[PDB]
Write an enzyme that holds these catalytic residues in place. Sequence first.
Site, PDB file in Angstrom:
ATOM      1  CG  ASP A   1      39.987  63.166   9.871  1.00  0.00           C
ATOM      2  OD1 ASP A   1      39.399  62.272   9.209  1.00  0.00           O
ATOM      3  OD2 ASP A   1      40.880  63.925   9.458  1.00  0.00           O
TER       4      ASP A   1
ATOM      5  CG  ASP B   1      45.064  63.326   7.810  1.00  0.00           C
ATOM      6  OD1 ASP B   1      44.440  63.893   6.747  1.00  0.00           O
ATOM      7  OD2 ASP B   1      45.289  62.352   7.859  1.00  0.00           O
ATOM      8  CD  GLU B   2      42.503  58.884   9.187  1.00  0.00           C
ATOM      9  OE1 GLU B   2      43.493  58.031   8.541  1.00  0.00           O
ATOM     10  OE2 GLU B   2      41.309  58.886   9.042  1.00  0.00           O
TER      11      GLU B   2
END
Length: 341
Positions: A7, A102-103
């Site tokens: 993350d 973003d993951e």
Amino acid sequence: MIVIFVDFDYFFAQVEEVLNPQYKGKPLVVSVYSGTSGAVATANYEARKLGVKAGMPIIKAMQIAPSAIYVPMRKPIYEAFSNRIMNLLNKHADKIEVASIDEAYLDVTNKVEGNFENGIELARKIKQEILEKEKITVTVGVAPNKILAKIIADKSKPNGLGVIRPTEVQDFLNELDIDEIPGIGSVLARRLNELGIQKLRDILSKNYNELEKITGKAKALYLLKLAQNKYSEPVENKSKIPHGRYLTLPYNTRDVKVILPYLKKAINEAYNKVNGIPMRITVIAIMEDLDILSKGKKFKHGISIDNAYKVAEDLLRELLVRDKRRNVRRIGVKLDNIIIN
């Protein structure tokens, strides 16, 4: 099974600091306004402590963070960085699941020959490389499944490296607070705490029906399974980042004969900017008054381009059999759930 969750720490805000070193240290806050009118998209910690978070109206944030450095949002830059890192992650795993910009989830049970200790070693090299090639801090979580990987990752960011070995699993879940579980609203957690549910294990000590009339079938099953670790979903090799091409007609109408030709071109272009077969297709129609009106469909297997034309046409029909007196000005397509590799 060895899962690695990565993350990007306050991504949007951290990139602006990489492009503006001087900002590094000060309360940076990535904004998202237009037209004033807007809200906080991202903000580093030096701004989070001052009481600034996402979803919070720019005004409220400005009123609590005057010294904070506000910068508009330049998503194309974040997208660029995101692509660069995601592809960097792709080579380190057997399967990769891009959850968002973003993951991501990685199944490395094979790259590490099933050795859970080496998965931590790899997650160390991963966290390192990203920092070297991109100058960005990422928090990583290493556990048997996705949910555990993500949970331990939160309790470890920023820049953290959460780890939950196969043996310390059932233990971790016990002393796990309801407020640390993803998917539960901060509101539903307060109520649960008011009802005596403090730890995830407290769930295994209360009538299920008595738990559903508060949580709901969805989250109740989720919590009950999670309290037993029966929520071990495999790491799908796909991407959940949407992509769609829109097109404006030579003149707004409702003539399928004119609209369709363009709807198919939007489909073709949408397919070119995608790295795989979509499992869902959404037909968006921007009507004369510019308001959106869409409908889509999800499929198990991938959706071929030839099937896209068919499905899309029917979706277009329906929208027209749902809205009268309203010529379509623009028409696009939005593909999601791309089966990669």
